[PDB]
């Protein structure tokens, strides 16, 4: 098909962190030819083999259906509901939809970062500077997608709204199970 791949940074702006050191972030990755879908995120997840806080994790999700280059609304809704329940405290999603040829490179980068979970050289979690949002920004930067400028203090809820100023918006509500894509 030659259809561009999809990278969908997702932020859960109403996610509650509760204890110190707003929102959580993850990323959906979709093969534009096949609809094969991956989800990765970085956060304060348990790891018995590392004493350094912060780990990448992969969450299994359904694949989407691509029809004439587009993701069908229903198949994306199924993934968004999965991600909200499994990673997002059953809250709403604010996202952007990015396009390019990068599926294998993104998959390799994410698996490579996950391979660092037990490394003595793993960069420690930092709520301000090395967190769920900066993981995704660093991925998009690495793909050549030129994400929005990263401030010294990265707040997922604030950053995603900045990112949306220059990209396609994705809004999803878990309670109503409704998706809206907009400029």
- In whole angstroms, give the CA distance from residue 23 to residue 169: 17
Nearer to Ca ion, 54 or 88 (CB): 88
Closer residue to Ca ion in complex, CB, 55/164: 164
Q: Nearest CA to 162 among 9, 28, 40? A: 9
Least Cβ distance, residue 97 to Ca ion (angstroms):
9
User: What is the nearest approach in angstroms of Ca ion to the Cβ of residue 165?
Assistant: 6
Stretch that binds Ca ion, among 76-84, 103-111, 143-151, 156-164 (CB under 5 A): 156-164
Nearer to Ca ion, 5 or 167 (CB): 167
Cβ closest to Ca ion, residue 68 vs residue 182: 182
Q: Rule CB under 5 A: is residue 14 a binding residue for Ca ion? A: no
What is the b/e burial string over 11-46, where b = at least 16 CB atoms within 10 angstroms of the residue's CB? bbbbbeeeeeeebbbbbbbbbbeebebbbbbbbbee
Is residue 164 a contact residue for Ca ion (CB under 5 A)? yes
Residue in 82, 138, 169, 173 binding Ca ion, rule: CB under 5 A: 169
CB of 147 to Ca ion, least distance (A): 13
Could you give the string, one character per residue 114-153, with x where binding to Ca ion holds by CB under 5 A and - elsewhere? ----------------------------------------
Span from 32-40, 64-72, 104-112, 164-172 in contact with Ca ion (CB under 5 A):
164-172
Cα–Cα distance between 35 and 136 in angstroms, integer? Answer: 20
Copy the structure tokens of residue 39: 């989800």
For residues 57 and 47, the answer to whether their CB atoms sit within 8 Å is no
| Widest Cα–Cα separation across the chain | 47
Query: Counting Cβ atoms within 10 Å, is residue 152 exposed (0-12), middle (13-18) or buried (19+)?
Result: exposed
Reduced to 3 states (helix: H, G, I; strand: E, B; else coil), residue 77 is helix
Question: Which residues contact Ca ion (rule: CB under 5 A)?
Answer: 164, 169, 183
């Amino acid at each position: 098909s030659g259809n561009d791949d999809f990278l969908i940074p997702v932020v859960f702006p109403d996610y509650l962190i509760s204890v110190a050191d707003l929102g959580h972030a993850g990323v959906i990755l979709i093969n534009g030819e096949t609809g094969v879908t991956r989800y990765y995120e970085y956060g304060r997840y348990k790891n018995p083999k590392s004493d350094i806080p912060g780990n990448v994790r992969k969450v299994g999700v359904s694949n989407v259906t691509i029809k004439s280059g587009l993701i069908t609304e229903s198949s994306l809704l199924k993934v968004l509901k999965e991600v909200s329940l499994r990673s997002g405290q059953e809250g709403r999603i604010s996202g952007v939809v990015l396009r390019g040829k990068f599926f294998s490179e993104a998959d390799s980068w994410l698996r490579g970062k996950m391979d660092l979970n037990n490394s003595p050289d793993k960069i420690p979690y930092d709520l301000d500077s090395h967190n769920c949002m900066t993981f995704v920004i660093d991925l998009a930067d690495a793909m050549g997608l030129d994400p929005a400028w990263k401030p010294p203090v990265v707040v997922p809820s604030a950053y995603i709204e900045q990112f949306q100023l220059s990209e396609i918006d994705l809004d999803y509500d878990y309670k109503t199970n409704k998706l809206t894509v907009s400029e």
